[PDB]
Design a protein around this ligand. Sequence first.
Ligand SMILES: CC(C)(COP(=O)(O)OP(=O)(O)OC[C@H]1O[C@@H](n2cnc3c(N)ncnc32)[C@H](O)[C@@H]1OP(=O)(O)O)[C@@H](O)C(=O)NCCC(=O)NCCS
Ligand SMILES: CC(C)(COP(=O)(O)OP(=O)(O)OC[C@H]1O[C@@H](n2cnc3c(N)ncnc32)[C@H](O)[C@@H]1OP(=O)(O)O)[C@@H](O)C(=O)NCCC(=O)NCCS
Ligand SMILES: O=C([O-])CC(=O)C(=O)O
Ligand SMILES: O=C([O-])CC(=O)C(=O)O
Lengths: 434, 434
Amino acid sequence: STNLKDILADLIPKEQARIKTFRQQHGKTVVGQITVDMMYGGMRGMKGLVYETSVLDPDEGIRFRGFSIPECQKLLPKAKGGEEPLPEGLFWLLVTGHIPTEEQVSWLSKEWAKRAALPSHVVTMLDNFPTNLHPMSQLSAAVTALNSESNFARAYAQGISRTKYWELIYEDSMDLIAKLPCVAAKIYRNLYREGSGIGAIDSNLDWSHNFTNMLGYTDHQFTELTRLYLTIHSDHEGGNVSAHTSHLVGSALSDPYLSFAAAMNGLAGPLHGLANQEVLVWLTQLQKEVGKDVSDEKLRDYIWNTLNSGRVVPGYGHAVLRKTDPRYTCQREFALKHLPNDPMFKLVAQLYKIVPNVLLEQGKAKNPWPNVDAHSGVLLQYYGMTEMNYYTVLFGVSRALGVLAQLIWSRALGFPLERPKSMSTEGLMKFVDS
Amino acid sequence: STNLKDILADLIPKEQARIKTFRQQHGKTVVGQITVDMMYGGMRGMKGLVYETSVLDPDEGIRFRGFSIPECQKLLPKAKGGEEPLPEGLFWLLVTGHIPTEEQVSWLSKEWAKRAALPSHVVTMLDNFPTNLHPMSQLSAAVTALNSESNFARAYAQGISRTKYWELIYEDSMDLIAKLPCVAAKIYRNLYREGSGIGAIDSNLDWSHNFTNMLGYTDHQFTELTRLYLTIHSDHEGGNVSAHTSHLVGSALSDPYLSFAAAMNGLAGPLHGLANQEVLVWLTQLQKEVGKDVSDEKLRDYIWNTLNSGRVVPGYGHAVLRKTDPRYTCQREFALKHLPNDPMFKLVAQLYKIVPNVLLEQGKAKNPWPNVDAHSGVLLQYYGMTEMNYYTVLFGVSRALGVLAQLIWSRALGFPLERPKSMSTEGLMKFVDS
Ligand SMILES: CC(C)(COP(=O)(O)OP(=O)(O)OC[C@H]1O[C@@H](n2cnc3c(N)ncnc32)[C@H](O)[C@@H]1OP(=O)(O)O)[C@@H](O)C(=O)NCCC(=O)NCCS
Ligand SMILES: CC(C)(COP(=O)(O)OP(=O)(O)OC[C@H]1O[C@@H](n2cnc3c(N)ncnc32)[C@H](O)[C@@H]1OP(=O)(O)O)[C@@H](O)C(=O)NCCC(=O)NCCS
Ligand SMILES: O=C([O-])CC(=O)C(=O)O
Ligand SMILES: O=C([O-])CC(=O)C(=O)O
């Protein structure tokens, strides 16, 4: 009806049947080869897992259940006075494969509003943490401590049918999504608002709005940016470190809280969730070095120096993507729509033109075009979100949507423990020699 | 000399050269095929990663740097008045590929004794946690909060050469190993010893002994069991969920603390680190149902019922192993040596004979023989370690040794971000159809 759990109950049998047939006909079909280099090279280009919620196409970028971000911008419900898609509807899409109605999204905002209360042990933990404990650590720790609240963990220990796993996983996932802005906002306030209270959840507000309210912002366009941000960082296929970590830990039947916290520890890594900060730090050094106002000619020579030094241009490139990132494009649209005379944004715009050509000549790049992280920092900074250490928390809150959507499906489809075979160098040499 | 870091500094270049040559000659060599079923089946039998510290051979079980557990029992230094190998020496083996001297192991015990102090924010967090927060959650949270202490995290943000990564990773890993018994013991005392202090580290004691002292035990043979336990659970190749999680999160350059905490969230999962408890719970139900003293004939009929009900016999089977687990064998040896007239152990012994034959006839089993978890609970319980929820913490403290050993090498060898490609069902169907 508007009850997601019932709609999902109807979808699951159909998907189980489809997969069962496909495995019966094509289980033994070879879809790729594993080389020595793939084993040493982090499984690069290895088809490794099934992940239903999103598929990253190298040339066009991300599709959410086969929908592009432009399609999502147009189709997904917006807040009444807003233009930006609500992350609620994105989650509905990832879970159901269907664009929700307005009423479905309204129902979901209300659900998450009612599940958001933190247990007091987690409030205490958060309030006692020192200011020098990184916000991503605080998040992960708190989410792990939330596992006390887990339906799945409790029911599993009492012996529960395999077929009922997804239901408890759904319940925990909805609970975690609900609580995450409260957790995230407590961290922000404890670190940068002298430990002031996060205030009330409003049952008539969407998730992003309750979040920006608890963060202590009121600017309507910041809420709009947050809706966009939370929508587009939500999922990036299954092979990224945070999706894969959530997937792997979850495959051992760790509850959503544990699986998500482990994902956060992966997103905290420099090579996964820190690029936003790296970009902003690089832009700041840029201005410092050549000046806050620059012609396109100087700017072109700086890139070259960067590269000759053997240093990357942050925010350009991607592991699998090979064209401009649609997550970048849509932030650009927001900017030139809402802050086009922003000096930092202008630099971001400038680099868009210049950097691509360079990286080409250099050769080594595969993808000479920008990723999402090239553009997120200047938007956030524009609206007073200046605490760069905190940025990966926003990413984390976003990424819950995609990874938990998929976790529900992994349990509904009965995906088993992920357990590849490892080899040593010595072992792999003898293997090859016979 | 006796400085591990210097010895490891000498080993690394040689291994880099060996791998570089091997990739140049054999990078493009195919070592396996990926099928649709492997993607749906948790990468089962997929050669997925390089993991140097240990290799699980399906027929003989685990080798630590090519040494068996029997070899390890004989070669590895023991405590002076002891017979059981010290986990210190195991860690030395995994790190160096070499059996340490007595003096090397003594040096290592002293190193870990000096690094063990907890920061006060982690003591506070632990002391404030409620009793209904699972010990594995408490561990993971505390380890994550320890990331405040990370050398690697700090140095990376200041820009550090790739070539120096392993050194800071070593430092953090040694620090984490040191602190882990203190963390683990604080949890145990807060949960089951009314929050009494963990008392002092003794700089002349080995790690396991300081650990059993902080746990509040004095029985010499418990310390001996702990040495054995911590040695044999230390590593089980790279494809298990906790090793792989540590490996994946670590590949994003998450520090050892974050990587290990994420591993713990995976070990907390029922299908990875809970089998010990499942076994004990099953044995208890067993006695309850058929009686605490039984002939081998009744016992044989119970198994059958279990199986006809569509329920597993816990502690039998393995994902990759296909014969009796040497980790099982060596606990048996300890038992029939130290507690042979233990009623629970006798049941464990009885099941050894009977269960294998059953599982055979049933067919479905691949491995009809016992794994390590069949045997750990009765040993621990025998010595008063009766809090089953806590058992996976012991496993966790053990598993640090192997996963952190390998983390050092992954960073020394410059292993890149792990990033396989995922596919949807829909996508994988179209892929196959062309
Ligand atoms: C995203 C990124 C890590 C992808 O790494 P990758 O898949 O290994 O990249 P490639 O396979 O294209 O690497 C080919 C070469 O181009 C280099 N390269 C890639 N992107 C580059 C960039 N934006 N600037 C400079 N050099 C770059 C690589 O370092 C490598 O050089 P090398 O041969 O000297 O080692 C890489 O493009 C990068 O470092 N970008 C900047 C950081 C960033 O924006 N990250 C966020 C996305 S995860
Ligand atoms: C360890 C274990 C999970 C391995 O799983 P696996 O690799 O999928 O096992 P297999 O491939 O051998 O499964 C073949 C069949 O034998 C069954 N089986 C395997 N071990 C069994 C056991 N000890 N008792 C009963 N049935 C068992 C499986 O459930 C499966 O039955 P199915 O066809 O009805 O689904 C499995 O042996 C098990 O459940 N053991 C008991 C729990 C345990 O000891 N786990 C700790 C080690 S991780
Ligand atoms: O795709 C990746 O590997 C990393 C990333 O950009 C993301 O997860 O959003
Ligand atoms: O090997 C596995 O997959 C699980 C396990 O027994 C271990 O990690 O010790």
